[PDB]
Design a protein around this nucleic acid. Sequence first.
RNA 1: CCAUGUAACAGCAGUUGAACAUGGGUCAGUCGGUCCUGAGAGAUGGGCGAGCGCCGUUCGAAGGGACGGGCGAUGGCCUC
Length: 130
Amino acid sequence: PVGGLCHYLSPPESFGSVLEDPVHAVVYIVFMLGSCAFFSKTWIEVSGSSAKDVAKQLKEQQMVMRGHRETSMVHELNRYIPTAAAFGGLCIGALSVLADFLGAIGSGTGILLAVTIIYQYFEIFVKEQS
RNA sequence: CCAUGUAACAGCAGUUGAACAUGGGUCAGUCGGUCCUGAGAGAUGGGCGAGCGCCGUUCGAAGGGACGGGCGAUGGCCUC
């Protein structure tokens, strides 16, 4: 909705900075950051990448912590896995807000998808070259 | 010892093990040692001994420590 359309919810768009009522601009980033962490936190619960599932993968591969039992795998994973998804989703959402506000190429959003995937195949590229 | 995992050994076997492999576990003023000397062991003095040494353990100028006083303690500058 950029013209002749309902403007209740809309991403900010302007050269430099646009500010008439912050009750619209600051709310957009709040809903964007919260949703991203909400989406990231729920994805691991369904994609089989939570702390509980990772330990089952490591148990299957016969990998253990140095001085912990098998049951303590989950607890050490829970120290980082659940909070990394919540904070990682928040950070990647914040990068989109920074990308959108700065007005980069690609209108900010979408380049985060591009930079990650090109990095995703980078790990293949480096390991296939000794 | 504990947990996890799993040819030789456990005079049969084992999916099991004090076996093998990986990784953990023993927290003290108050429970012990540490202190005492007991039977005894054993230095120093001394004696003996070719000598390494050993006999001897009370048979030698064997005290190194005491609140109290003045020179100088003056030191905090004199309370202790």
